[PDB]
Symmetry: D2
Subunit: 340 residues, 4 copies
């Protein structure tokens, strides 16, 4: 009757109505190819807000044109993006949800034409372009891009900011020795490989004091790569720097075979949560209320992130409530339909 | 694999991608109380379009201020409504769906303050206001209101127009002897009680040649009321007047106890379909793809109208496809989620 | 709350606790190949009784060795079968269900080695053995086999007897002009083609006064075959002969392509029910309580026969009750599990 | 496609076809009140075997008349019980499943009329009878009862034996300081409170070398009671004594409020599994294949025990397979129904 899934959760004064989070998912719907919010986004995101999702994280938003995954990504490299993002924020919040945004940079995995950058001039695979080895100017420049992105998100009115340090993208590339072969202060050791992430966090915190999320790939799924245990010290530091919650994913630094199954990334979320003593978000094949409640009640994570399931059904929270025999507030307009 | 539910259906050159129709449902979301389309409607309806609903029928829209059910209904009594409706139409169609609108007049069941009109000065119940017995001027005036509504819907860009002659509202009141005690040419016989509906249809057809729906209450659930068989002759006439499909509902002319169960109004839809030889829409507790397919394949109706189920899940078509082991086109953005 | 699906139904003093019937389904589990009831049957059938199925119809039971579909069918051609059948009956009824048996003869569709019999020496298809054209001695002999089967079922303690006149088997072959080319009193006209069925019914009624079912194939799905309308006169006669309910199926007299979909045989059940004025059983892709309730409430059939669905879940009635928001008596042992 | 839930598991040469176990559940169906297997049990258990459950654990079976929970429990205090149990075993295994039995003694929680025994003369609650403080003769006697029960189970042909040391029953009472106030070698310390369990295990192992399970209550849910961590040393010893798997439950030593939720006992199973380095069984609100797969793949347990869910649906494994997109061997009789 009284579940944890539909119990409020507060982060730095921001109270989420429940533990349900819409995981950041690229829509590749910027038809103008200028990183601008389009009509699609204005229908896509607010629909989940009506569905009673507590927190909606907007897809990976490129902090630079080269930082995009594709030419159809959302962008935040220009003050001109603020208006569209502000409109999106207004629409989502107006319908009851808190809204966040995922600041991102694809790095060597960018599919945008032209030069792409990485810690080292090593391609993702034999079929990918060789990225440019970033100079220290490029580094502080990219850090500034993240800070500016954060400032624009703040102006747009976002409630939450997430730093995308996962899925083998730019920050993840600095993190993993598989991609980071630098021999300056940005590579060659756990501390050095973390530096870039540390500087991004600090820069963001200069202009942003709201809830701050970091999304990581807890594992590289490679013998010579990173494991969940490597991220425990990193999470402790993130905590000291004022990161509020770790959004725990995994993989994609290089091509690799992964054993995918229900809750396959949950152990990573709990590892960091209990060892680094920091709130975590669980993601990866979470599709049922029954499943989500188990994750919460057993203290494996504090928030549950839903991906593809929210693509199949934007009103998932209602089905989850039914599933758990719980009752939640429905939009007044849908009360006749939302029966418990 | 190849179901009827997800097979196209053509009405007067308008081809629906499937047989799934979103039944007209009042949202009471016109906070400005001027019948204007609001932000809510612009999120509510297009969401079902993304969900792959073939035809979306907009809620009962008052053809006059007094014709509204409540002060929060949509309205179409002014050319000023066209802009908002046109924007709504654009949003819905842009996301893949055909769009219709339900022209309505609450009659004696209107809850709007002030005078309300009906065929006879008989209240809905002992707790309702006594309506004014319409004069012949009121009648031709109300007919003109429907015509103007149709013209505005056409300008807005609607694909389908439905005339709301059901649920005990104005037109239904002229139809049922329970509410129509007039002793002129508009009451006293089956032919006379039909006159008002006939004139509305003709007037609408003067300015509208697209798909035309009529929604009826096949039964009054009263010993001295109308039965499904009474509507067979009416459907034959509607057919002659150029009505393309009969949206078959029931009840609500007066307070009455109804036996509600799955598909409880389907027999009415099939009765009219086979006896009047006219395409029909089935509505009333249709909630599963399995159920909807049975209705179609057995020739009980040509379209299936979903109500509350589309309130619980705007992407119902996907679940129905899964349910039937069928595969349908998903919005490109949701392909990773919409697995078959 | 009070559904029709879980409302009692009385046939000749036999009261079924609900409208749910387990359709006769061959298990091919007589490993001894002597038509004897085996351990499998003693677990298979009583499980559905615990599941709260109102009436359980035992699979097609060969009234003669040659009358079996396969060497692994149940048999009733010997008094020696009574003991096993009586044990089965005891087990099923002990757990709350009424029990019936389907008296059967495969005819030309028998796959048992050796001579097989039919109205005419016409094979099922070019890949099947040519059956012997039955003599009038064979006919009255086969009729006697059905009577003896009925007598043994009575001794075993069965509550209901069904005559299998469907799925292109022996009796169905006499019924359909596609297979019956006889030029005596058993072919050449509707009356003559019915004679065999008529004689079987009379013979059974000589030794059995309990509920009597007849299972028919309402359609041959062939231009020159039988249609549902042909069976209306037949059902009227069956009624006069004391047949209590018509179990309405279809097809299988010859190879043919059938359009299979949810409730695809329901229109046949309702046709006979309303035109012949006789209780009918609906069967064919009935899998949900929602669906079953619609069939009942709309008077399309009086009993609902479940096939493969009861193979997937023997406790279907519980799921159906949940589905309909209804509550039914659970076996006291399962009360903690069977929550409503 | 290849899940862990439907992957074989071997314990001491006994190979289970999958990881699905039917948790021991009292049926209170011994109407003769002599601990004898009845018809009900012979239908109840084999049904789950057909449902493709890998291992079926028979309900708590009293090793003495006073050791029963109720007068309707199964019993094994007499060689006369062997015949009935052997028949049950035959029925279950014949239909594809391995079978186990739970040797039990209710202790102070017995509801059987007359004297009841416990480590100390302390009632379960103020509403329960005061049990007799067992003498050392009673102890070695009760140990002998367990050994004899094991010997009879072996003769009956059981594949697995489980010792019921949980749910606040006799053995659990010796384990918990809440109920054990003895001041001899059987109380007053962790080692002493374990002694009784240790002696039961040894005695059972004298006459039984097959798979041996022990079911424990990992927590008393009481400030002065046992916690999961207390059972880590116990599990290490059980391992040394030849216990093959720990069936991990919790609670019921005294009245207490428990927070019940999906997988609420899983953390206990994983604790013991990883800390004591011994295979464990997870139980407690496990109802979906999705859930069960997560438990297995994440190494939280080696076997998954289903309780009430197998009461709602004896063929759960089929639904779980569907749920996981996996395909498993269906009983050849149900192949047409069991579609994947
Ligand atoms: C279409 C699609 C787009 C995605 N884009 C992003 C993204 O922009 N940022 C991100 O962190 N993860 C992205 N992912 C991963 C999802 O956020 C989510 O973590 C992943 O799909 C696993 O969650 P799920 O199994 O519940 O779907 C995307 C996934 C999908 C299916
Ligand atoms: C909230 C709500 C508003 C409705 N408003 C309308 C309406 O404006 N026009 C109409 O014809 N029917 C209206 N109805 C009836 C629905 O269109 C539909 O026919 C009815 O709810 C039965 O369908 P269902 O059982 O699938 O929900 C409304 C129903 C609901 C629940
Ligand atoms: C395995 C199996 C065995 C069957 N054996 C019989 C039978 O013995 N007698 C009969 O009349 N129909 C038999 N049929 C048809 C069923 O009785 C039932 O009418 C048909 O399968 C449609 O039911 P369903 O769609 O609900 O599964 C059998 C069907 C199956 C799948
Ligand atoms: C009707 C019933 C009888 C039970 N009897 C036993 C029993 O004999 N032995 C035992 O160890 N647990 C018994 N329990 C507990 C179950 O074995 C199981 O561990 C508990 O019900 C949790 O399982 P579930 O949540 O999956 O249903 C019983 C539970 C129920 C509901």
């Amino acid at each position: 009757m009284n579940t944890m899934l539909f119990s409020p959760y507060t982060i730095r004064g921001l109270t989420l109505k429940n533990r349900i989070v819409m995981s950041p998912m690229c829509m590749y719907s910027c038809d103008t190819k200028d990183g601008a919010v389009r009509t699609w986004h204005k229908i896509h995101y607010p629909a989940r807000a009506v569905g009673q999702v507590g927190l909606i994280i907007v897809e990976a938003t490129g902090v630079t044109p080269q930082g995009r995954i594709s030419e159809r990504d959302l962008g935040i490299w220009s003050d001109d993006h603020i208006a569209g993002l502000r409109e999106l924020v207004g629409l989502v919040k107006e319908h009851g949800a808190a809204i966040g945004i995922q600041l991102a940079h694809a790095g060597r995995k960018s599919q945008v034409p032209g030069e792409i950058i990485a810690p080292s001039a090593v391609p993702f695979d034999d079929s990918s372009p060789t990225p440019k080895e970033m100079t220290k100017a490029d580094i502080e420049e990219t850090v500034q891009a993240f800070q500016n992105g954060a400032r624009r998100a703040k102006e747009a009115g976002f409630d939450v900011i997430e730093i995308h340090a996962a899925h083998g993208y730019l920050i993840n590339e600095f993190l993993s020795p598989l991609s980071n072969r630098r021999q300056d202060e940005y590579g060659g050791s756990p501390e050095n490989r973390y530096r870039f992430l540390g500087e991004v966090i600090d820069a963001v915190r200069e202009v942003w004091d709201g809830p701050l999320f970091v999304r990581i790939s807890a594992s590289d799924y490679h013998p010579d790569g990173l494991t969940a245990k490597d991220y425990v010290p990193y999470a402790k530091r993130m905590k000291e720097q004022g990161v509020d919650l770790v959004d725990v994913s995994s993989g994609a630094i290089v091509p690799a075979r992964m054993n995918v199954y229900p809750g396959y990334q949950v152990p990573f979320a709990e590892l960091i949560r209990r060892e680094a003593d920091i709130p975590t978000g669980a993601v990866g094949l979470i599709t049922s209320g029954w499943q989500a409640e188990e994750i919460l009640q057993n203290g494996r994570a504090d928030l549950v992130f839903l991906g593809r399931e929210l693509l199949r059904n934007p009103y998932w929270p209602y089905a989850a409530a039914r599933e758990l025999g719980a009752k939640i507030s429905a939009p007044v307009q849908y009360e006749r339909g939302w029966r418990f």
